[PDB]
Subunit: 356 residues, 3 copies
Amino acid sequence: FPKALGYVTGDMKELANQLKDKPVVLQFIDWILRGISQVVFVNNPVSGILILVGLLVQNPWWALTGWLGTVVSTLMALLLSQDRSLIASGLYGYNATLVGVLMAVFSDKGDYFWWLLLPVCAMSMTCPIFSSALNSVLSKWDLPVFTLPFNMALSMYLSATGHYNPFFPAKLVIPITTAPQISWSDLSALELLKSIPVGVGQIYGCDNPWTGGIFLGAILLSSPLMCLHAAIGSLLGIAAGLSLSAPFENIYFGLWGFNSSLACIAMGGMFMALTWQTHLLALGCALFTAYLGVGMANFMAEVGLPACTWPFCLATLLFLIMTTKNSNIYKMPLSKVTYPEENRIFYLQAKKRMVE
Amino acid sequence: FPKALGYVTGDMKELANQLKDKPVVLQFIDWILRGISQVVFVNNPVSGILILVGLLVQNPWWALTGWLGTVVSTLMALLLSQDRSLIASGLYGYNATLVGVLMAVFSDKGDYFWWLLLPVCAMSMTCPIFSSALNSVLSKWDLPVFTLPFNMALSMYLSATGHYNPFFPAKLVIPITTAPQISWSDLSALELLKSIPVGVGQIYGCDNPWTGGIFLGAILLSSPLMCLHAAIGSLLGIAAGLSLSAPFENIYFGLWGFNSSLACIAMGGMFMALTWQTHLLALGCALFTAYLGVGMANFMAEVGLPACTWPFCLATLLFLIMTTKNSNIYKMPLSKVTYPEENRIFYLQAKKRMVE
Amino acid sequence: FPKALGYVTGDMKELANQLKDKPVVLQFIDWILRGISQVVFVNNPVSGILILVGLLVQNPWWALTGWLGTVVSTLMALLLSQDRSLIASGLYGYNATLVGVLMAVFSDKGDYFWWLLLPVCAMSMTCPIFSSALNSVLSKWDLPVFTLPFNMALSMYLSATGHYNPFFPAKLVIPITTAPQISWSDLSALELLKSIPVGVGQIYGCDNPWTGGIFLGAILLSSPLMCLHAAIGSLLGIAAGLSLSAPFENIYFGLWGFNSSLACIAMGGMFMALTWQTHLLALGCALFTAYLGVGMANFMAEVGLPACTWPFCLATLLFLIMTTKNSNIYKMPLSKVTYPEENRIFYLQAKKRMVE
Ligand SMILES: CC(C)CCC[C@@H](C)[C@H]1CC[C@H]2[C@@H]3CC=C4C[C@@H](OC(=O)CCC(=O)O)CC[C@]4(C)[C@H]3CC[C@]12C
Ligand SMILES: CC(C)CCC[C@@H](C)[C@H]1CC[C@H]2[C@@H]3CC=C4C[C@@H](OC(=O)CCC(=O)O)CC[C@]4(C)[C@H]3CC[C@]12C
Ligand SMILES: CC(C)CCC[C@@H](C)[C@H]1CC[C@H]2[C@@H]3CC=C4C[C@@H](OC(=O)CCC(=O)O)CC[C@]4(C)[C@H]3CC[C@]12C
Ligand SMILES: CCCCCCCCO[C@@H]1O[C@H](CO)[C@@H](O)[C@H](O)[C@H]1O
Ligand SMILES: CCCCCCCCO[C@@H]1O[C@H](CO)[C@@H](O)[C@H](O)[C@H]1O
Ligand SMILES: CCCCCCCCO[C@@H]1O[C@H](CO)[C@@H](O)[C@H](O)[C@H]1O
Ligand SMILES: CCCCCCCCO[C@@H]1O[C@H](CO)[C@@H](O)[C@H](O)[C@H]1O
Ligand SMILES: CCCCCCCCO[C@@H]1O[C@H](CO)[C@@H](O)[C@H](O)[C@H]1O
Ligand SMILES: CCCCCCCCO[C@@H]1O[C@H](CO)[C@@H](O)[C@H](O)[C@H]1O
Ligand SMILES: CCCCCCCCO[C@@H]1O[C@H](CO)[C@@H](O)[C@H](O)[C@H]1O
Ligand SMILES: CCCCCCCCO[C@@H]1O[C@H](CO)[C@@H](O)[C@H](O)[C@H]1O
Ligand SMILES: CCCCCCCCO[C@@H]1O[C@H](CO)[C@@H](O)[C@H](O)[C@H]1O
Ligand SMILES: CCCCCCCCO[C@@H]1O[C@H](CO)[C@@H](O)[C@H](O)[C@H]1O
Ligand SMILES: CCCCCCCCO[C@@H]1O[C@H](CO)[C@@H](O)[C@H](O)[C@H]1O
Ligand SMILES: CCCCCCCCO[C@@H]1O[C@H](CO)[C@@H](O)[C@H](O)[C@H]1O
Ligand SMILES: CCCCCCCCO[C@@H]1O[C@H](CO)[C@@H](O)[C@H](O)[C@H]1O
Ligand SMILES: CCCCCCCCO[C@@H]1O[C@H](CO)[C@@H](O)[C@H](O)[C@H]1O
Ligand SMILES: CCCCCCCCO[C@@H]1O[C@H](CO)[C@@H](O)[C@H](O)[C@H]1O
Ligand SMILES: CCCCCCCCO[C@@H]1O[C@H](CO)[C@@H](O)[C@H](O)[C@H]1O
Ligand SMILES: CCCCCCCCO[C@@H]1O[C@H](CO)[C@@H](O)[C@H](O)[C@H]1O
Ligand SMILES: CCCCCCCCO[C@@H]1O[C@H](CO)[C@@H](O)[C@H](O)[C@H]1O
Ligand SMILES: CCCCCCCCO[C@@H]1O[C@H](CO)[C@@H](O)[C@H](O)[C@H]1O
Ligand SMILES: CCCCCCCCO[C@@H]1O[C@H](CO)[C@@H](O)[C@H](O)[C@H]1O
Ligand SMILES: CCCCCCCCO[C@@H]1O[C@H](CO)[C@@H](O)[C@H](O)[C@H]1O
């Protein structure tokens, strides 16, 4: 356990290095699994395997379409001569992971609608394009693209099909038009506790509590700090939902937790170096993101769309673009971002250099 | 009167300088009052007091929530280590002024719904963040953020609550679905004249004609040119409304005047040096802004939102980003923007330098 | 024929050069006709005459309002001291061409509603402003503005009037709310073939097949490659429509073809040098653009608007911003863009220089 562990924590760069001479198919599978895990900012193929297992526990059909999307986007990125370092760390696959899974989730035709593999492929082939274009812009400000490629691809696909498409109908999204009757005496502490892993699970559209727990274990295996912040951000989404008197069903289903979870991971040591100041900033950002999440869900329902993780992308870019004159609130150079423990060591070293 | 006057015109930089050694609470109150007056591009705490009086004449509850928002945003800006020069000239408070007032205005729970002070605080704490992020982008093109922070915060809050929220319901916004019967014989010249100050008053969501008049006097006290352009832009909004056969009630209520008023102030000597060419350009921009105002009100009503001053921000940024080869149409360096009289002296000097 | 031909192919730069000394009214008419032809990226006044003839075959009223818009925008661009090279090649007129025609097309008052010439003028005067502002941004990334000026002007005008305006009502746009009954046995190969020129004709909102054919001949006269790509992109839009089970009426009317036609022209040798790789990329972009076209039509119908060519602008900017490490997928310097034959000669020369 102690020896074998260190080999599977972090971003497994030793395995990445040892694969560079191995048969190209093994390298490809490594890129697929890292693409899957990058949905939660993790660059680790063992975490990608565990996330696959969680997807399979939720619904093997969604596991299939998410895996298929990852493969097609990775192949497209190669056909289009994208940067190999980005491909090899999964950054040309994770948006198509979300595309495949959530196309399955929002289909109105149910499990194993095999025709769905056509649009799943089609939209997956657009993810590198979306990814390349956005990167070419945002990298000039040293910002990441997050899941903007996925959200653009999905809003476009779901607007194009809609509920009335004869071939690929989507689920009908209906805006609220009555105040939800709220009976606070039925509030269940056990179900709210359960909503924390579910909120993590909904990052991949999964409502099964066991799947959210498996996702948390995947993150934990890569990085304990990231896992802490995933859980905390899910929790903060729950608290926000209750602050706005949201129907308990939606909280229990994790709909208030996946955006704030993603924002809390990103801000809590990932793209900002972890100090007590940026920890509080990440809690603030998670809360803010939950409020933006419900606002965008309402707004998008007026046009028949889900919000998915538009809220996370917009909020987290906003917090990363804000400046301060506080030396302890430090944004990571993207070329130096790995995972919170390591980022913190970099920050402390650079600070000792600043103090010389 | 003549001696004491000069001390209260302009941006009162002598008082700003004399406060730098005074007790920190007096400095803070000065920053609050300047934040209030910056809603109309004025950097003057006496104007901020007069605007407070106008708010109180409209509705003391809105005065309270606007003041509270200004205070919380200013405190947040300090907690977040924002630039002190910007804070001290009110630029980290005015967006939260609008947030506090217009949250009161669009609440469906009426005057003195004390629970409303919670979201008023919450959204006010986001205004520095919105303000910092936007500034970090727009200042690279030497552009101001205008009221984009406020409009983003408010669209997000109002989308998140909506009309059916059990705790903080908003007013219901209903899109038009019948042509308004228009009886032109009832057009009242007295009421259209009255619509000019009301259009200025609606910059802070105030429909009381006395309040609009007090706002005009606040602007006048700081700068006669800015006050002229406020009035003219309100008037141009009226004319636009009539050009589109708008219902008289909406014109009389000032809904056609506040965006074009703001655009006319901004363009008429503030962010462009005042020449006869830029005066005409500012009239054009005010008209354009009124037309964009009604377009965005219709579009946003389709999703349940008011447009507030999205039209002013988008239109005025558009006119400030346009280039010309006309030496007399000159955009002010932001580091040199104070108020139109002074900006014009700078422009004339720089032009004499250009002619040497 | 052989001698006189070469004088009218391409961008007719010899005529442009010989006009520089001629009476200023002839120069102005040349700028008008080039503005008209730039709707399809053509810089050629004979093509502009042929496109006028096609407009007249569709509906002389639309010919009138499109011509009037071109004239007013060109005059405005001069009044505002815009760059003369851009004006003289039609780039300050084509957005107002579309404004005039499509305001006529979406009016609910029918042919020869003479009052419509007021908003046609008004919105045409905004096209240089929109054009200047957008250029000032996009030219920093070496990107064109495409028809974003037109689409912004039109979305703003149509939102401001809407269907219920007492003076300038627009056509009512109704979102889909039932699945279209689809009877595939009635599919007509003759009508699908006819949909190719109609798809080109709808670039100017024209459904008459003869008008689309005249437009294709205008493009052909300037550049055979551009004409090939116009036809192919229209065809690809047809195929997309059938892939999404669109009602045959909409395909036959060319609604699936005009955006993908424009994208295919732009990408197929115009703003990318033409190689077999960029030819395939342009086919992909045309298909992608057709799918985005239907998505934006659905989304915009939820707020009462047409999509017009928002899809073409957004998709083509996206494909032009994507990077690759493929030396054969080469984006043209804007200062070197003329028409595909010539651009290809430039690319081959620069490549021989790269290989030395
Ligand atoms: C969720 C929406 C409605 C509001 C989001 C607000 C948060 C983003 C704010 C509220 C409290 C703020 C924190 C309160 C005060 C502090 C301590 C402050 O530290 C100091 O200024 C002194 C110590 C030092 O030198 O760093 C740094 C900012 C921070 C973490 C703030 C960060 C931003 C926070 C978390
Ligand atoms: C409201 C929407 C529908 C249209 C908005 C149009 C305005 C922005 C346009 C219309 C008339 C234009 C003005 C008409 C002509 C002039 C004179 C022109 O001056 C000159 O070109 C010669 C003198 C010199 O050298 O400056 C400068 C631009 C200006 C003010 C134009 C500025 C822009 C204006 C106000
Ligand atoms: C319409 C939406 C749903 C999908 C749009 C997908 C297209 C944009 C993709 C699909 C097939 C792709 C093409 C398939 C493979 C090739 C060959 C490839 O050439 C090479 O990599 C080797 C030869 C060389 O060195 O150039 C260049 C990219 C290209 C044209 C690809 C360009 C982008 C294409 C057309
Ligand atoms: C029972 C737990 C051990 C299972 C088999 C060994 C896997 C441990 O991991 C091993 O770590 C080594 C580090 O020196 C690497 O060189 C190996 O490639 C790697 O497999
Ligand atoms: C091509 C698609 C855009 C790529 C932009 C990457 C910018 C972010 O940077 C990446 O963040 C990852 C976390 O998600 C880390 O695993 C990587 O080490 C880091 O380089
Ligand atoms: C190849 C790895 C991905 C999973 C493939 C699983 C195929 C299951 O097959 C599906 O099983 C259903 C019953 O469970 C049937 O109702 C469906 O018709 C059938 O297609
Ligand atoms: C069917 C999917 C196969 C994907 C592998 C394609 C790899 C080769 O395609 C590309 O060729 C370019 C030529 O200039 C190279 O620059 C790129 O590195 C390469 O990715
Ligand atoms: C690369 C993408 C390939 C897509 C292949 C689609 C094959 C469709 O297959 C069909 O699916 C239907 C719906 O589930 C079933 O009812 C049919 O039995 C099956 O033939
Ligand atoms: C270019 C694409 C053409 C594909 C034609 C495939 C037709 C498949 O079949 C059709 O599927 C429809 C789906 O709702 C049904 O409504 C039709 O009755 C059925 O005939
Ligand atoms: C590119 C187009 C691929 C999808 C076309 C068919 C999708 C809808 O086809 C579905 O399944 C059966 C397939 O024969 C039909 O009979 C059903 O009516 C329909 O629900
Ligand atoms: C009746 C009008 C006068 C009221 C009291 C004096 C206020 C005038 O203003 C005074 O101007 C001086 C300029 O020399 C400053 O030094 C003072 O601080 C300021 O109070
Ligand atoms: C932090 C929030 C953004 C600040 C950007 C300020 C850019 C505009 O600049 C400011 O304009 C004011 C008028 O409104 C003037 O009073 C100031 O003197 C001037 O610096
Ligand atoms: C402290 C400065 C801000 C203004 C505070 C005013 C408090 C008024 O108090 C309000 O007065 C109403 C009657 O006018 C009552 O109906 C409300 O219940 C009461 O809260
Ligand atoms: C409760 C509200 C109190 C606001 C005052 C907080 C001022 C101190 O907080 C911040 O500390 C930073 C430490 O690096 C400094 O750089 C900043 O200038 C300062 O604003
Ligand atoms: C910093 C923000 C503090 C918010 C304090 C909210 C206090 C709520 O106070 C309550 O308000 C209700 C609505 O007006 C009244 O009906 C109750 O009497 C009153 O107790
Ligand atoms: C974490 C936040 C939990 C706050 C619980 C406070 C409940 C206040 O009370 C509730 O207010 C609702 C408002 O419409 C009413 O509908 C309920 O009947 C009432 O019990
Ligand atoms: C963070 C949550 C704060 C707001 C919760 C309560 C807001 C709605 O509470 C309001 O006033 C009374 C308060 O007891 C209730 O009885 C009323 O039903 C309700 O209208
Ligand atoms: C019948 C076809 C010819 C019609 C009249 C001559 C038009 C041909 O075009 C001519 O080409 C010349 C190139 O040397 C130019 O110098 C002329 O200006 C141009 O008119
Ligand atoms: C002022 C409005 C924006 C102008 C930006 C022009 C950038 C594109 O560049 C232009 O493309 C045209 C094709 O459409 C070519 O005819 C021109 O030669 C080329 O310069
Ligand atoms: C001047 C060049 C543009 C075309 C002008 C055409 C004017 C036609 O005039 C129109 O003709 C219609 C019948 O066709 C009548 O019904 C309309 O009332 C009349 O205005
Ligand atoms: C009624 C329409 C007439 C249009 C012609 C106007 C041309 C002069 O107006 C402008 O004057 C500026 C003065 O600095 C020059 O820089 C510009 O080149 C010029 O276009
Ligand atoms: C520069 C813009 C000038 C606009 C002139 C508008 C003239 C309106 O003219 C009117 O048009 C009506 C509608 O077609 C007709 O019914 C009337 O007979 C005609 O007088
Ligand atoms: C500032 C602009 C004022 C213009 C007033 C012109 C009135 C033209 O006339 C009006 O046109 C309306 C159009 O639907 C009709 O409903 C009215 O009955 C009619 O009187
Ligand atoms: C700037 C305002 C210009 C347009 C105002 C009138 C537009 C609608 O006027 C139209 O035509 C006739 C004109 O008298 C009216 O009698 C009709 O009722 C109306 O349909």
